[PDB]
Design a protein around this ligand. Structure first.
Ligand code: PRO
Ligand code: PRO
Ligand code: CL
Ligand code: MN
Ligand code: MN
Ligand code: MN
Ligand code: MN
Ligand code: NA
Ligand code: NA
Ligand code: OH
Ligand code: OH
Lengths: 478, 480
């Protein structure tokens, strides 16, 4: 069948990928006792937007659930799926003649049917008439809460929908659950996004020089990715140098990658391109001047140790919060070896000291969204403890899940000062040694992995050992 | 005073630029007989957004009026200006402690006061109390219609605003009129955006090779611009090759710069970086293989002729629609000299034949928005004729306006076929020559210019003659 392709060496993505997702969704819905015979899933695609009140167009990126189900890149569409038969219908805008002048060819409905390999295509203005003819029992629409943003998903609406029976509770948990488990076709796309993003990270490590602005490396990364067919990034590039490497989502408008990289700084670059709305998320940490100091090597190798320990322990049935605590324990052991900490590591763990150094979650589901859906389905509770409460899932691992593994150690003044004021934590901290690390920034090492039947598959391929990184930055051939 | 600067060779932009805009707005409002003593301008800044229901953040770019007045890059702010005194107060978010971990330093109010050179800084949740204490007569808020999008500007609102008298009609036309006329400080920024975008266009012409995808050149352009501190483009890059060069806003999600460039194609690349929310908009047209054919040279030089004629005629007092008609006439003359058209050019103009080949407006105001505000203030009407109806302004030129000059000639099948079906237009077209230009695409030559006291200043600096373009594509130093 047809494939999405941007030519050159970009990945050909079969539209069969989305057909399989529709089939999988129907199979889940058919097993749901609340689902009535003759139900139709109704999804509404994203629409074109502009900046504020201006006519400045924003490049359109499809809504993630709609993309998962249909792979459609055009704005203004709807898509429906008959649950009992799996039959798919795409609804496309009926365009005015002037579109031909300003926007491009006015494709026929048959063109879209062949392009997307759906069973039928109709115009958007006919959706009520078409659905009416199908005599559905109920329309299943999308409404639920995203557990990372707290936002409510926007349910489909069209002129005349009030004449139908509509259910907006059944679908969301079911389609979320399908998205949690990646098909082999989806994994192929995630291997490509990781390949290109990994290559771009390597080019960035080779290019970094003292005196550059952080945004120069954002620029280079996005150039490499967009040359590889990625018009979008998965999230705003985080290019933190020096003390900014301790700022977890650095790079947003309020802190816009505008610092000059100085000799002796650590760099923490968290960047990932997006291909056909599939994410990647990779973090590389390294010295700006290409040579780890003793202190930098010690912190860096501590995070390398926890990274490797977590990846090695991951397999079906492992509880993700246990991986987070494993990383905590390793960091505390290493910080104790360094002399930053003293005492019983068991006692440090009881006092939640790990969270002073890693305040974020160990890692998260990744897919069509970088912080992918389904981390906290009904029955899965957030753990109300430092560090763990920031975990984006408390689930047990199963084959087909895709996770980031991103331990880090940071020296964050307000967390350190808090710990130093607390007699339950202060006795573990050696102020005279810690002082040397004030302003160090931080290290994060982030890999993307897939859970397999017996372990994991690593998607990411960047230099990771101190020797590998220094060789890469020194411009060595291999 | 303080400046916005992204280091290296980027432009230092004094925050005095925005103080001058606030002063100009106050001066204009003080002269407005309907403005009450003790009025305060109240603007609401943009807020950060995410993709749909996800937590995927969208890089925040400030709302344009708020930017014009304050230059503030942070989301979630408000800004007020006392009309009678000119005193400015910025309201910033009161951030949670966790911001320090995830987002960065929690800057003090004094930090923002020094950064933006405003008179006072307060937290946003205190806006009702602060304004109550100042005892304003009226709050002047922003509401009006953008004449390019048809959208209504978002009026400021805050909890407790219902306790104040609010006027939402006075401000919009006045602040729009201030934006229409660029200060010398604003022109410095527009010169920088044009410099970097021009250089990026030159790099693209030097790099293009037959066999590339259009999006590879979009990628190169944005790389050059972002290396120069332009994190955003002014609009989505239009990289049309072959027949796609006849599609005016090609490059959007539905037609995403995904064609392979072929030998013999013309390229039409309309791209412009944005620096600190100031736009650029430049179009370069050239042969993909670096050598104009005779047919390509003829079409290209027709548009070069109208470009230069319009630039030569522009000065204060000139009616912009007259410039559009001048370009139409030149295109028709040259298409006749090429043998594509025959008969009386005067008759062709009466039949609106120019619009078949240039269906869009000659050019538009440019500023903080690429299609800048104020093209159609009250009393200025849109002309209901082919081509002219797409003009984004029907104003007379005055010093300080910034305009694009962007004539083009395209071979658009449904427009050509309409003309051939119309007895009033069909006889002018010579099908035996025209057939050769089906699928040609088109040529557009777009310069950014400033209206001066007596003429124009050209901002754009790219190769324009056939000889200059072929030299650029052959890798010649720009000085040559
Ligand atoms: O937001 C998160 O979960 C991870 C933590 C480090 C940056 N991204
Ligand atoms: O929208 C406009 O007015 C111009 C016409 C060509 C592309 N941009
Ligand atoms: Cl013809
Ligand atoms: Mn990351
Ligand atoms: Mn991540
Ligand atoms: Mn343009
Ligand atoms: Mn333009
Ligand atoms: Na293992
Ligand atoms: Na070239
Ligand atoms: O991350
Ligand atoms: O343009």
């Amino acid at each position: 069948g047809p494939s999405f392709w941007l030519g050159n060496e970009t990945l050909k993505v079969p539209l069969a990928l989305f057909a399989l997702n529709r089939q999988r969704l129907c199979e889940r819905l058919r097993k749901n006792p609340a689902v009535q015979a003759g139900s139709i899933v109704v999804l509404q695609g994203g629409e074109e937007t502009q900046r504020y009140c201006t006519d400045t167009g924003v490049l359109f990126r499809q809504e993630s659930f709609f993309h998962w189900a249909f792979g459609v890149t055009e704005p203004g569409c709807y898509g429906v799926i008959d649950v009992d038969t799996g039959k798919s219908t795409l609804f496309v805008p009926r365009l005015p003649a002037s579109h031909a002048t300003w926007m491009g060819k006015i494709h026929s409905k048959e063109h879209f049917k062949e392009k997307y390999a759906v069973d039928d295509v109709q115009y958007v203005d006919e959706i009520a008439s078409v659905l009416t003819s199908q005599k559905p029992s109920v329309l299943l629409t999308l409404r639920g809460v995203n557990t990372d943003s707290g936002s409510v998903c926007r349910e489909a609406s069209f002129d005349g929908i009030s004449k139908f029976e509509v259910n907006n509770t059944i679908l969301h948990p079911e389609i979320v659950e399908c998205r949690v488990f990646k098909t082999d076709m989806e994994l192929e796309v995630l291997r490509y996004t990781n390949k290109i993003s990994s290559e771009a990270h390597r080019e960035v490590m080779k290019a970094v020089k003292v005196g550059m602005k952080e945004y120069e490396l954002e620029s280079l990364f996005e150039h490499y990715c967009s040359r590889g067919g990625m018009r979008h990034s998965s999230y705003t590039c985080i290019c933190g140098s020096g003390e900014n490497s301790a700022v977890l989502h650095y790079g947003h408008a309020g802190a816009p990658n505008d610092r000059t990289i100085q000799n002796g700084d650590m760099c923490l670059f968290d960047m990932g391109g997006e291909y056909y709305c599939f994410a990647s998320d990779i973090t590389c940490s390294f010295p700006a001047n290409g040579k780890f100091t003793a202190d930098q090597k010690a912190v860096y190798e501590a995070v390398l140790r926890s990274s490797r320990a977590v990846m090695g322990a991951m397999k079906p049935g492992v509880w993700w919060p246990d991986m987070h605590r494993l990383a905590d324990r390793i960091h505390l052991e290493e910080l104790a070896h360094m002399g930053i900490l003293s005492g019983s590591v068991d006692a440090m763990v009881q006092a939640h000291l790990g969270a002073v150094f890693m305040p974020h979650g160990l890692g998260h589901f990744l897919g069509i969204d970088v912080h992918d859906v389904g981390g906290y389905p009904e029955g899965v509770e957030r753990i109300d403890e430092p560090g763990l409460r920031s975990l984006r899932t408390a689930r047990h691992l199963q084959p087909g899940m895709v996770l980031t593994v991103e331990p880090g150690i940071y020296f964050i003044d307000h967390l350190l000062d808090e710990a130093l004021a607390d007699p339950a934590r202060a006795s573990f901290l050696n102020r005279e040694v810690l002082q040397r690390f004030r302003g160090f920034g931080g290290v994060r090492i982030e890999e993307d992995v897939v859970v397999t039947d017996s372990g994991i598959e690593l998607l990411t391929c960047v230099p990771r050992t101190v020797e590998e990184i220094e060789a890469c930055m020194a411009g060595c051939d291999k």
